[PDB]
mmCIF file of C-alpha atoms and ligand atoms in Angstrom:
data_model
loop_
_atom_site.group_PDB
_atom_site.id
_atom_site.type_symbol
_atom_site.label_atom_id
_atom_site.label_comp_id
_atom_site.label_asym_id
_atom_site.label_seq_id
_atom_site.Cartn_x
_atom_site.Cartn_y
_atom_site.Cartn_z
ATOM 1 C CA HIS A 1 -5.412 -8.261 6.878
ATOM 2 C CA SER A 2 -2.410 -9.699 8.654
ATOM 3 C CA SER A 3 0.564 -11.183 6.796
ATOM 4 C CA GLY A 4 2.019 -14.459 8.080
ATOM 5 C CA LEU A 5 5.557 -15.413 9.024
ATOM 6 C CA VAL A 6 8.098 -14.388 6.432
ATOM 7 C CA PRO A 7 10.193 -17.369 5.235
ATOM 8 C CA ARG A 8 13.843 -17.185 6.361
ATOM 9 C CA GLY A 9 16.022 -15.463 3.747
ATOM 10 C CA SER A 10 13.048 -13.767 2.071
ATOM 11 C CA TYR A 11 11.352 -10.401 2.584
ATOM 12 C CA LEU A 12 7.803 -9.035 2.598
ATOM 13 C CA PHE A 13 7.197 -5.348 1.871
ATOM 14 C CA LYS A 14 3.763 -3.986 2.736
ATOM 15 C CA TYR A 15 2.876 -1.117 0.377
ATOM 16 C CA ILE A 16 0.132 1.454 0.621
ATOM 17 C CA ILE A 17 -1.130 3.716 -2.163
ATOM 18 C CA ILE A 18 -2.654 7.009 -1.030
ATOM 19 C CA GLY A 19 -4.023 10.131 -2.681
ATOM 20 C CA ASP A 20 -7.336 11.658 -3.650
ATOM 21 C CA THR A 21 -10.220 9.612 -5.044
ATOM 22 C CA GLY A 22 -9.981 8.831 -8.735
ATOM 23 C CA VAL A 23 -6.251 9.467 -9.212
ATOM 24 C CA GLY A 24 -5.758 5.803 -10.247
ATOM 25 C CA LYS A 25 -4.490 4.164 -7.026
ATOM 26 C CA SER A 26 -6.452 0.961 -7.578
ATOM 27 C CA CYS A 27 -5.549 0.764 -11.253
ATOM 28 C CA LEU A 28 -1.861 1.197 -10.335
ATOM 29 C CA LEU A 29 -2.121 -1.739 -7.921
ATOM 30 C CA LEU A 30 -3.785 -3.985 -10.487
ATOM 31 C CA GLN A 31 -1.530 -3.002 -13.375
ATOM 32 C CA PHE A 32 1.456 -3.963 -11.261
ATOM 33 C CA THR A 33 0.079 -7.149 -9.697
ATOM 34 C CA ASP A 34 -1.981 -8.490 -12.633
ATOM 35 C CA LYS A 35 -0.576 -6.641 -15.672
ATOM 36 C CA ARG A 36 -4.136 -5.639 -16.526
ATOM 37 C CA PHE A 37 -6.113 -2.424 -16.818
ATOM 38 C CA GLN A 38 -9.917 -2.578 -16.693
ATOM 39 C CA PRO A 39 -11.876 0.569 -15.724
ATOM 40 C CA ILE A 40 -11.330 -4.035 -6.010
ATOM 41 C CA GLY A 41 -12.932 -6.888 -4.061
ATOM 42 C CA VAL A 42 -9.796 -7.587 -2.009
ATOM 43 C CA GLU A 43 -7.779 -5.918 0.751
ATOM 44 C CA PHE A 44 -4.503 -6.291 -1.156
ATOM 45 C CA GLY A 45 -2.762 -7.593 -4.261
ATOM 46 C CA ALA A 46 0.449 -9.570 -4.040
ATOM 47 C CA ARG A 47 3.382 -10.033 -6.380
ATOM 48 C CA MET A 48 6.856 -11.532 -6.130
ATOM 49 C CA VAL A 49 9.702 -9.379 -7.239
ATOM 50 C CA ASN A 50 13.412 -9.970 -7.426
ATOM 51 C CA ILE A 51 15.664 -7.448 -5.749
ATOM 52 C CA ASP A 52 19.426 -8.120 -5.651
ATOM 53 C CA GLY A 53 18.743 -11.804 -6.387
ATOM 54 C CA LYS A 54 16.378 -12.118 -3.405
ATOM 55 C CA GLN A 55 12.713 -13.139 -3.211
ATOM 56 C CA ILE A 56 10.635 -10.216 -2.049
ATOM 57 C CA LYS A 57 6.882 -10.335 -1.817
ATOM 58 C CA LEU A 58 5.146 -6.995 -2.268
ATOM 59 C CA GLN A 59 1.714 -6.909 -0.643
ATOM 60 C CA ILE A 60 -0.022 -3.796 -1.881
ATOM 61 C CA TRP A 61 -2.988 -2.631 0.206
ATOM 62 C CA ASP A 62 -5.930 -0.866 -1.405
ATOM 63 C CA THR A 63 -7.906 1.907 0.365
ATOM 64 C CA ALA A 64 -11.226 0.293 -0.728
ATOM 65 C CA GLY A 65 -12.477 3.765 -1.755
ATOM 66 C CA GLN A 66 -12.687 4.901 1.870
ATOM 67 C CA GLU A 67 -11.067 8.254 0.985
ATOM 68 C CA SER A 68 -14.180 9.126 -1.058
ATOM 69 C CA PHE A 69 -16.237 9.521 2.156
ATOM 70 C CA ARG A 70 -14.184 9.210 5.369
ATOM 71 C CA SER A 71 -10.731 9.151 6.940
ATOM 72 C CA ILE A 72 -8.315 6.348 6.155
ATOM 73 C CA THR A 73 -7.952 4.032 9.158
ATOM 74 C CA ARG A 74 -4.675 3.940 11.070
ATOM 75 C CA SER A 75 -4.499 0.146 10.529
ATOM 76 C CA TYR A 76 -4.132 0.813 6.799
ATOM 77 C CA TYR A 77 -0.908 2.825 7.312
ATOM 78 C CA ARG A 78 0.622 0.604 10.009
ATOM 79 C CA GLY A 79 3.610 -1.544 9.131
ATOM 80 C CA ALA A 80 3.977 -0.231 5.571
ATOM 81 C CA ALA A 81 7.513 -0.315 4.188
ATOM 82 C CA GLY A 82 6.580 1.564 1.017
ATOM 83 C CA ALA A 83 3.994 4.124 -0.083
ATOM 84 C CA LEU A 84 3.001 5.475 -3.462
ATOM 85 C CA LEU A 85 1.676 9.011 -2.950
ATOM 86 C CA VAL A 86 -0.402 9.669 -6.048
ATOM 87 C CA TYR A 87 -1.959 12.597 -7.834
ATOM 88 C CA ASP A 88 -3.669 12.849 -11.239
ATOM 89 C CA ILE A 89 -1.710 15.029 -13.679
ATOM 90 C CA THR A 90 -5.026 16.139 -15.212
ATOM 91 C CA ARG A 91 -6.474 17.507 -11.947
ATOM 92 C CA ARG A 92 -4.534 20.162 -10.040
ATOM 93 C CA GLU A 93 -6.722 19.850 -6.941
ATOM 94 C CA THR A 94 -5.353 16.324 -6.438
ATOM 95 C CA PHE A 95 -1.849 17.814 -6.491
ATOM 96 C CA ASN A 96 -2.925 20.453 -3.949
ATOM 97 C CA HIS A 97 -3.764 17.725 -1.433
ATOM 98 C CA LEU A 98 -0.358 16.040 -1.465
ATOM 99 C CA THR A 99 0.919 17.814 1.630
ATOM 100 C CA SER A 100 -2.047 16.648 3.676
ATOM 101 C CA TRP A 101 -1.719 13.041 2.513
ATOM 102 C CA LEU A 102 2.018 13.117 3.183
ATOM 103 C CA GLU A 103 1.484 14.444 6.706
ATOM 104 C CA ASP A 104 -0.929 11.596 7.469
ATOM 105 C CA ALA A 105 1.447 8.969 6.083
ATOM 106 C CA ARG A 106 4.180 10.411 8.273
ATOM 107 C CA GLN A 107 1.916 10.587 11.343
ATOM 108 C CA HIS A 108 0.652 7.013 11.067
ATOM 109 C CA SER A 109 3.394 5.030 9.302
ATOM 110 C CA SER A 110 6.958 4.226 10.329
ATOM 111 C CA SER A 111 9.549 6.980 9.857
ATOM 112 C CA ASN A 112 11.538 4.507 7.712
ATOM 113 C CA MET A 113 8.761 4.116 5.118
ATOM 114 C CA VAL A 114 9.947 4.864 1.596
ATOM 115 C CA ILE A 115 7.555 7.226 -0.210
ATOM 116 C CA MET A 116 7.464 7.691 -3.977
ATOM 117 C CA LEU A 117 5.491 10.568 -5.406
ATOM 118 C CA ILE A 118 3.520 9.539 -8.501
ATOM 119 C CA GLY A 119 1.884 11.719 -11.120
ATOM 120 C CA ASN A 120 -0.537 9.268 -12.695
ATOM 121 C CA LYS A 121 -2.461 9.334 -16.006
ATOM 122 C CA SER A 122 0.583 10.407 -18.048
ATOM 123 C CA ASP A 123 -1.176 9.020 -21.134
ATOM 124 C CA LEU A 124 -3.583 11.992 -20.931
ATOM 125 C CA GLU A 125 -0.927 14.490 -21.997
ATOM 126 C CA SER A 126 -3.425 16.720 -23.846
ATOM 127 C CA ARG A 127 -5.316 17.115 -20.557
ATOM 128 C CA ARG A 128 -2.253 17.862 -18.403
ATOM 129 C CA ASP A 129 -3.084 20.302 -15.539
ATOM 130 C CA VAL A 130 0.155 19.836 -13.471
ATOM 131 C CA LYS A 131 3.606 20.253 -15.037
ATOM 132 C CA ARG A 132 6.153 17.470 -14.519
ATOM 133 C CA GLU A 133 8.496 20.056 -12.926
ATOM 134 C CA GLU A 134 5.894 20.739 -10.208
ATOM 135 C CA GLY A 135 5.916 17.102 -9.139
ATOM 136 C CA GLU A 136 9.710 17.008 -9.275
ATOM 137 C CA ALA A 137 9.930 20.083 -7.045
ATOM 138 C CA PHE A 138 7.477 18.707 -4.489
ATOM 139 C CA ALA A 139 9.438 15.472 -4.305
ATOM 140 C CA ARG A 140 12.754 17.273 -3.718
ATOM 141 C CA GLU A 141 11.251 19.480 -1.022
ATOM 142 C CA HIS A 142 9.931 16.444 0.850
ATOM 143 C CA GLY A 143 12.773 13.961 0.204
ATOM 144 C CA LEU A 144 10.708 11.721 -2.036
ATOM 145 C CA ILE A 145 11.383 9.828 -5.221
ATOM 146 C CA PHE A 146 9.210 10.920 -8.220
ATOM 147 C CA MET A 147 7.846 9.338 -11.388
ATOM 148 C CA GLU A 148 4.980 9.961 -13.775
ATOM 149 C CA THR A 149 3.019 6.819 -14.588
ATOM 150 C CA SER A 150 0.155 5.526 -16.668
ATOM 151 C CA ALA A 151 -1.807 2.687 -15.096
ATOM 152 C CA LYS A 152 -3.564 2.419 -18.474
ATOM 153 C CA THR A 153 -0.533 1.976 -20.747
ATOM 154 C CA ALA A 154 1.645 0.583 -17.916
ATOM 155 C CA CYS A 155 4.272 3.306 -18.530
ATOM 156 C CA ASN A 156 6.647 3.383 -15.557
ATOM 157 C CA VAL A 157 4.368 1.260 -13.357
ATOM 158 C CA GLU A 158 6.833 -1.616 -12.913
ATOM 159 C CA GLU A 159 9.594 0.900 -12.303
ATOM 160 C CA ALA A 160 7.590 2.750 -9.652
ATOM 161 C CA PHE A 161 7.012 -0.365 -7.595
ATOM 162 C CA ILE A 162 10.436 -1.939 -8.225
ATOM 163 C CA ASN A 163 12.416 1.249 -7.603
ATOM 164 C CA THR A 164 10.584 1.778 -4.320
ATOM 165 C CA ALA A 165 11.470 -1.819 -3.382
ATOM 166 C CA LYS A 166 15.136 -1.287 -4.314
ATOM 167 C CA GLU A 167 15.244 1.701 -1.969
ATOM 168 C CA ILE A 168 13.584 -0.166 0.931
ATOM 169 C CA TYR A 169 16.031 -3.029 0.392
ATOM 170 C CA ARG A 170 18.960 -0.572 0.343
ATOM 171 C CA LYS A 171 17.849 0.879 3.697
ATOM 172 C CA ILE A 172 17.555 -2.630 5.166
ATOM 173 C CA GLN A 173 21.075 -3.566 3.995
ATOM 174 C CA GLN A 174 22.349 -0.317 5.559
ATOM 175 C CA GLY A 175 20.490 -0.896 8.848
ATOM 176 C CA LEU A 176 18.671 2.403 8.167
ATOM 177 C CA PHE A 177 15.280 0.702 8.067
HETATM 178 N N1 GDP B 201 -6.479 7.479 -18.841
HETATM 179 C C1 GDP B 201 -6.136 6.921 -17.649
HETATM 180 N N2 GDP B 201 -7.152 6.621 -16.803
HETATM 181 C C2 GDP B 201 -6.853 6.077 -15.602
HETATM 182 C C3 GDP B 201 -5.457 5.796 -15.230
HETATM 183 N N3 GDP B 201 -5.474 5.265 -13.988
HETATM 184 C C4 GDP B 201 -6.785 5.201 -13.620
HETATM 185 N N4 GDP B 201 -7.598 5.661 -14.596
HETATM 186 C C5 GDP B 201 -9.075 5.797 -14.539
HETATM 187 O O1 GDP B 201 -9.299 6.655 -13.432
HETATM 188 C C6 GDP B 201 -10.480 6.260 -12.709
HETATM 189 C C7 GDP B 201 -10.118 6.014 -11.252
HETATM 190 O O2 GDP B 201 -9.224 4.907 -11.113
HETATM 191 P P1 GDP B 201 -9.064 4.182 -9.685
HETATM 192 O O3 GDP B 201 -7.914 3.218 -9.775
HETATM 193 O O4 GDP B 201 -10.386 3.606 -9.240
HETATM 194 O O5 GDP B 201 -8.674 5.430 -8.746
HETATM 195 P P2 GDP B 201 -8.594 5.482 -7.139
HETATM 196 O O6 GDP B 201 -9.907 6.064 -6.645
HETATM 197 O O7 GDP B 201 -7.463 6.459 -6.900
HETATM 198 O O8 GDP B 201 -8.323 4.065 -6.677
HETATM 199 C C8 GDP B 201 -11.019 5.030 -13.389
HETATM 200 O O9 GDP B 201 -12.059 5.499 -14.272
HETATM 201 C C9 GDP B 201 -9.814 4.523 -14.145
HETATM 202 O O10 GDP B 201 -10.186 3.745 -15.272
HETATM 203 C C10 GDP B 201 -4.408 6.155 -16.204
HETATM 204 O O11 GDP B 201 -3.204 5.965 -15.938
HETATM 205 N N5 GDP B 201 -4.824 6.708 -17.368
HETATM 206 MG MG1 MG B 202 -9.291 2.909 -5.302
#
């Protein structure tokens, strides 16, 4: 995919969503863009958001399941303004792989990319395998924002995408982007 010219006065933020297979990356995308959950046929989902009164299009790229069998292509990472780095709170091994995903994002995306750490599947509290505090600590260590989300119930999904956008916008307005 290649996005077109951005209309004057508006913004376009390319997002990526990375993490182990099955953590809910695709469901997060669709919950945000479509407000639906159905346990993706497209390279990306798009949605208009409003940040500081401005029109900002978020174009959220999906890995197309490639991480289940091969490396993620460099083209996927390129030009991203935002990344959700996702693990599944019910599976510790997905939390163990965060450092490796983060290192790849930092190797292949712009240094200015805003990364939010996401512990997904918060609705499965009885199956929790990673404590909230562990996610919080990882985020602090790596200078990331952190939320727990449920793509299923939509808990914190809007906030994850919008708060990431607010931060990108803040960096732009500060010339730090
Ligand atoms: N209970 C629950 N299940 C989820 C959630 N997010 C995703 N799933 C389920 O997790 C599985 C993997 O989701 P998917 O979006 O394909 O993960 P991806 O491989 O990381 O893109 C599917 O069976 C989803 O229905 C969530 O927040 N809660
Ligand atoms: Mg997927």
